[PDB]
Homo-oligomer: A and B are copies of this chain.
Amino acid sequence: AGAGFKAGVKDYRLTYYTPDYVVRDTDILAAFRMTPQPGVPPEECGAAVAAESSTGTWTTVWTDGLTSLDRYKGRCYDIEPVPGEDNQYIAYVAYPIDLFEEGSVTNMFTSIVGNVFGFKALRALRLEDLRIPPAYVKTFVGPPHGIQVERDKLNKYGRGLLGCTIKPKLGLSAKNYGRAVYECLRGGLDFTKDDENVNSQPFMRWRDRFLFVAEAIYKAQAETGEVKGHYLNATAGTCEEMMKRAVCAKELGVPIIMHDYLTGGFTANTSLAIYCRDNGLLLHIHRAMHAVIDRQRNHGIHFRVLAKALRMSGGDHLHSGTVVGKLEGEREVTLGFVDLMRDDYVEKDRSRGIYFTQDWCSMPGVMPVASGGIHVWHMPALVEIFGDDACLQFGGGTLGHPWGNAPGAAANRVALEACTQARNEGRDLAREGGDVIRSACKWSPELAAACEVWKEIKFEFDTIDKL
């Protein structure tokens, strides 16, 4: 009499709640914020999540006996109650490395977040963090270039990079796009970009835009003597259309394209990142749709996980939020995932939402892009939050300048350089920021015009995505 096949249902906790498990250094770990239904204990909820993201279903199957379920099973190995909550728990789940397809963020998400969020036995579920072990990190191509290589190709050092989304979001012609781009770039911005939803449309077809934008890039570069780029959007309905757009950028010799990784998707994104590696194009990643997933504290996937996923799938830039602009991003939360995006090794730190120590094993860092509702008075705060390895983008903050795009660009560039110099001289941008900007507004007429228009504009609201 050995263990035989026993048909029927049993608790998931009997197999998948294993609190004495010693996590392996190749295991993928997940931290889930779980809200059980009444009558379902946390250990059963955590075990259900582990089981149905790994090896298990709702009734016992005989085929388990042909393999080793202990070798492959996901394991809920720890549960902690959430402070301030009487029905939220953090469940920790360990996944053997054999469960995952090498180099596939798609596969990793399909297991860990594929079905478990819809279980009737839970009321809410949020994936807070993932520990991606070095042995799995090494299966990914990763980002095409990463921060150091990007600065080296651009020949740009010693300050944040400056970008700008062209406006109106939609409705401009290709030639007006290029006109706006030239005027922005020539005033001191390093980059402009297609809006995330500018792909190819009746009012402006993509290839027309790419050609006029190429003219604008090369005109502004020749005029200023600084390398310029414009993130041309390769986001498309199909992978063949996406690749056609990347090929056209390659053939025009321009430096940088963009992709909306969540609305295009990880399979297409990973393909595009590999193309960019093989053809030397920088790849800017827009996180369109992320807040559908990541806004609420009780349910979804925290942005830090979406950022890790993008680092793995591949991107030279990724939007990080601004903290102070029109879209939400609490300071400590943001500082934590910026480190996860940029750094090689990030220690556990629950005060910044870092549930696991993360070792990136030399995968290139991704440049954070702070964008959305920011203007010249936010410059000191942005430089203080991000430091030099960030791109700060001013769309309305450039195309809303009273004197037009070139003056608007110059205002942003002067502001950034004034903040950067002040910090280098030992000034505390957190205390002296307003004084730094005021002094620069006195000196530069272009900056002064921006300073006056946006002086009272602030975005200060109650935060939803709190730790």
Provide the A105-145 mask, 1 if CB < 8 A to any CB of B, else 0.
11101110111111111011101000001111111000001
In the complex the two chains form, is A207's CB within 8 Å of B173's CB?
A: no
B residues in contact with A201, CB < 8 Å: 98-101, 107
The minimal Cβ–Cβ distance linking A229 to chain B, given in whole angstroms, is 16
The minimal Cβ–Cβ distance linking A408 to chain B, given in whole angstroms, is 9
Q: Which of A7-43 contact B (CB under 8 A)?
A: 7-9, 25-26, 37-38
B residues in contact with A107, CB < 8 Å: 197, 199, 201, 235-237, 263
Say yes or no for A57: interface residue by CB 8 A criterion.
yes
B residues in contact with A102, CB < 8 Å: 138, 237
- From B61, B197, B293, B373, A168 is in contact (CB under 8 Å) with B61
B residues in contact with A268, CB < 8 Å: 239, 265, 267-268
In the complex the two chains form, is B236's CB within 8 Å of A104's CB?
A: yes
A selection of 28 A-B contacts at a CB cut-off of 8 Å is A56-B168, A57-B395, A58-B373, A58-B396, A59-B375, A59-B454, A66-B172, A67-B203, A98-B201, A98-B361, A103-B237, A107-B197, A110-B260, A110-B289, A114-B263, A115-B372, A117-B291, A120-B328, A121-B326, A149-B175, A152-B175, A208-B280, A237-B267, A237-B270, A238-B270, A292-B300, A295-B299, A296-B298
Say yes or no for A391: interface residue by CB 8 A criterion.
no
In the complex the two chains form, is B237's CB within 8 Å of A62's CB?
A: no
B residues in contact with A277, CB < 8 Å: 205, 207
In the complex the two chains form, is B106's CB within 8 Å of A235's CB?
A: yes
Query: Closest chain B residue to A242 by CB distance?
Result: B267
Provide the A376-406 mask, 1 if CB < 8 A to any CB of B, else 0.
0000000000000000000111011110100
In the complex the two chains form, is A169's CB within 8 Å of B98's CB?
A: no
In the complex the two chains form, is B328's CB within 8 Å of A401's CB?
A: no
- From B110, B271, B397, A239 is in contact (CB under 8 Å) with B271
Say yes or no for A196: interface residue by CB 8 A criterion.
yes
Say yes or no for A462: interface residue by CB 8 A criterion.
yes
In the complex the two chains form, is A180's CB within 8 Å of B211's CB?
A: no
B residues in contact with A139, CB < 8 Å: 138-139
In the complex the two chains form, is B236's CB within 8 Å of A101's CB?
A: yes
- From B8, B176, B211, B262, A453 is in contact (CB under 8 Å) with B8
What 13 new A-B contacts, CB under 8 Å, besides A98-B201, A114-B288? A7-B401, A55-B168, A59-B397, A66-B173, A97-B361, A99-B201, A118-B321, A121-B326, A123-B464, A124-B296, A138-B138, A237-B270, A265-B265
